[PDB]
């Protein structure tokens, strides 16, 4: 404090009264408010000199939230690591923050800046001949590590599997590891002539993300998150063209591997003879000294007894020093042995491209240890207002549960309760009315429900195609082709197949009947399937997202938990407890009480070459 007299109105503030900071006379031009408690930064966008501070904050801080008027950023250690790496010295940050803030910069914040910024770049992880070496420019840093000694100018070799433990331990100590690839000065790895085609244009936000990645002229391993359809694949192509080394790409699905191969051969000048695919059908590798190989997390991290050809390809991948790895959908990297794909592959630069950087467990905070610091956040409202992604109208329809259904809801176990709150007849009526209304508007509609039985029952009741796990692949392709082109099929019912990476036609309306508990990742993945619509160029176009939930159930709790991520992106879920046209729709599913009773009792009913012939 600064001898500030405590007012009686400061009683309920838990030591957060920052009134001791004396207000500057020229404060009105300065758009920042620095909080000494946690380094949180409050920015006013409406003032002048806001964007000239907004770029400074997105370089030195991580944005907690970006609403319309007041933006909230976080000064953290990893943001400062990327801040000093791109050439911002310590005194420049303090001078600019002092110049651009109303309240004075507190000495605790300044000391945090000095402490996080200094002792950076001391310890470095380098790879020499498929062998991990941790290197330090100062001698005694080797001798101060005596606890996690995994030893097997000043540098010592560590084991390939122990690199994550070293990164965690050095992050606990005040010496974070520097992971930068000087591909310009790297000559042991053979170069590639990969370059973007001149006909391919790159959007400014992608350029900003890649400038965050390649700011200092050296490739920095990290994470880039962009919305679905905003061109994260093109960012991967451009990063590969920037590094110009051997590239390995990991995906979650074989169709994603095919799409990545197609995008590589389209946007950049890479010959198909330099491209190799490691899947079940295709296992032939490129014979050149450098190239691209694309594969899946599961095959690379397969602990089971793999085939001889796959073993030979895995030996080729492990024995080759790769210059770049692109991990698509990096949110599944913190899994059990998807964690090990950074250890089994010696890659100088690691770029993790994602759209949904959340998990329900805490292991999503381990990706800075695995891949690297979170390099770029895409502002989804900033991309929506520029037409790069669709302008979705997120909504949450409250479906009240009927009397006979809610009585059975309370005298049941949670597993049967999950099925029972989905199949309430008011949700049937709401889904039917929304389907009819958005089909009259001429919208392609996807209805998501993770419950397979509920998906089938809704589709049979409403006469629409349904796609789930046991559907044959050719039937799935035929149904999707009818959805894309036939105008009589504008509604498709999809299970968790549509949540994961499968190719879908463009849709503008989504109705979420059910969900997998409080999965924020699945919620944002479902929203990402209507964010790349073709009609974004049309003025006044808006996509629609409906989350049909049963009122006064646990579905409300899980729905709020899933929506907690999208309100962080800025989406506002407007509640809809009334639909105009409920009483005047021609056909209502389960309107009569006897039909509802029959539906309830149906839901409750759910739960020696010669002797060989004789045998």
């Amino acid at each position: 404090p600064a001898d500030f007299v405590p007012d009686s109105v400061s009683g309920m503030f838990r030591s957060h009264d920052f009134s001791y900071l004396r207000l500057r006379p020229d404060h009105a031009s300065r758009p920042l408010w620095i909080s000494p408690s946690d380094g949180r930064i409050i920015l006013e966008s409406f003032s002048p000199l806001a964007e000239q501070a907004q770029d400074f904050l997105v370089t030195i801080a991580e944005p907690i939230s970006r609403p319309s008027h007041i933006h909230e950023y976080k000064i953290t250690a990893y943001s400062l690591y990327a801040a000093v790496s791109v050439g911002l010295e310590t005194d420049d940050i303090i001078s600019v923050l002092d110049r651009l803030s109303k309240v004075p910069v507190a000495e605790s914040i300044i000391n945090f800046i000095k402490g996080a910024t200094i002792s950076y770049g001391k310890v470095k992880l380098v790879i020499k001949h498929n062998r991990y070496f941790v290197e330090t420019t100062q001698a005694d840093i080797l001798q101060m590590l005596l606890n996690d000694s995994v030893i097997g100018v000043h540098s010592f070799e560590i084991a390939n599997e122990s690199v994550e433990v070293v990164k965690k331990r050095c992050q606990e100590i005040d010496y974070p590891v520097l992971e930068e690839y000087d591909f310009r000065n790297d000559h042991r790895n053979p170069d590639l002539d990969i370059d973007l085609k001149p006909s391919t244009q790159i959007r400014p936000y992608q350029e900003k993300s890649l400038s965050k990645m390649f700011g200092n002229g050296r490739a920095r391993s990290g994470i880039i998150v962009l919305p679905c359809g905003a061109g994260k694949t093109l960012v991967g192509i451009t990063a590969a063209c920037t590094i110009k080394k051997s590239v390995i790409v990991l995906c979650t699905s074989s169709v994603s591997v095919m799409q990545w191969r197609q995008q590589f051969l389209q946007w950049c000048t890479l010959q198909p003879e330099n491209c190799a695919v490691f899947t079940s059908d295709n296992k032939e590798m490129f014979q050149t000294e450098s190239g691209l190989v694309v594969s899946t997390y599961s095959m690379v991290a397969n602990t089971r007894n793999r085939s001889h050809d796959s073993q030979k390809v895995m030996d080729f991948l492990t024995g080759r020093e790769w210059g770049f790895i692109i991990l698509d959908e990096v949110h599944v990297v913190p899994a059990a042995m998807f964690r090990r794909v950074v250890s089994t592959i010696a890659a100088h630069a690691k770029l993790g491209l994602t759209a949904t950087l959340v998990r329900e467990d805490d292991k999503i905070g381990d990706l800075n240890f695995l891949i690297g610091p979170k390099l770029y956040e895409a502002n989804w409202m900033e991309l929506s207002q520029k037409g790069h992604i669709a302008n979705v109208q997120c909504a949450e329809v409250w479906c009240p549960m009927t009397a006979e259904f809610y009585q059975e809801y309370l005298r049941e176990t949670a597993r049967k309760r999950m099925l029972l709150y989905i199949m309430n007849p008011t949700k049937f009526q709401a889904c039917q009315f929304l389907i009819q209304y958005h089909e009259r508007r001429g919208d392609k509609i996807i209805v998501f429900s993770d419950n397979v039985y509920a998906l089938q029952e809704y589709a049979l009741k409403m006469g629409k195609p349904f796609i789930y796990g046991s559907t044959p692949q050719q039937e799935r392709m035929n149904i999707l082709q009818n959805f894309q082109y036939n105008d009589q099929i504008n509604t498709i019912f999809l299970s968790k197949v549509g949540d994961t990476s499968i190719d879908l036609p463009e849709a503008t309306c989504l109705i979420q009947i059910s969900s997998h508990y409080g999965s924020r990742r699945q919620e944002a993945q479902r929203l990402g399937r209507i964010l790349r619509a073709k009609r974004r160029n049309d003025e006044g176009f808006n996509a629609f997202f409906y989350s049909l939930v049963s009122k006064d159930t646990q579905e409300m709790y899980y729905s709020t938990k899933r929506q907690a991520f999208l309100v962080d992106q800025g989406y506002a879920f407007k509640v809809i407890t009334h639909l105009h046209g409920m009483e005047n729709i021609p056909n209502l599913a389960y309107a009569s009480p006897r039909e509802r009773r029959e539906l309830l009792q149906e839901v409750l009913l759910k739960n020696h070459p010669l002797i060989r012939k004789m045998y």
Binding site: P400, M401, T402, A403, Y406, Q407, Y409, L410, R411, G518, K551, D552, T553, Q554, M556, Y557, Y558, T560, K561, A564
Partner: protein, 65 residues
Amino acid sequence: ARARKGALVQCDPSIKALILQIDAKMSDIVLEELDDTHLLVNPSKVEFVKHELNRLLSKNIYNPM
């Protein structure tokens, strides 16, 4: 033409279904059922019913920390 000491309450069928399990748990909660929306709660426990109702519906509300 007899008189009792009770309180008439208005509720949706979901809350109506909720408070019958309160009767199944604690005996002196409701006396008899009138309709699908009108119930007769004993006035000595109505606030207590309130004191559990927000507690009973708290499982349906997600509270961030």
